[PDB]
Amino acid sequence: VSDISALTVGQALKVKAGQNAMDATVLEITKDGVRVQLNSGMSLIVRAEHLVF
Secondary structure: OOOOOOOOOOOOEOOOOOOOOOOEEEEEEOOOOEEEEEOOOOEOOEOOOOOOO
């Protein structure tokens, strides 16, 4: 509710995998970033200053 940190789980946003965006789906969230599921097929996202939800 009101997003966990900067977003919520299952929010889904960008990770940017190799200079280009990719898309990744939130599995868990961090201090302000997340640990998403990469559309590349990974899971990680990054910190809030790197996500573009």
